[PDB]
Structure 1
Amino acid sequence: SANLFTPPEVLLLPIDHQPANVTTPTLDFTNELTNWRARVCELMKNLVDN
Structure 2
Amino acid sequence: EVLLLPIDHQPANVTTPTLDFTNELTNWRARVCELMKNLVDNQRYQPGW
Shorter chain as normaliser: what TM range? 0.7 to 0.9
Measured against aligned partners, the alpha-carbon deviations of 1:1-50 in whole angstroms (never above 9, x if no partner) come to xxxxxxxx100001100000100111010010000000000100010011
- Size of the aligned set, in residue pairs, is 42
C-alpha distance in structure 2 between counterparts of 1:21 and 1:35, whole Å: 20
- Equivalent in 9, 34, 38 of residue 26 of structure 2: 34
Gaps of 5+ in 1: 1-8
Gaps of 5+ in 2: 43-49
Query: Root-mean-square deviation (CA), in Å?
Result: 0.5
C-alpha distance in structure 2 between counterparts of 1:28 and 1:20, whole Å: 12
1:3 corresponds in structure 2 to: none
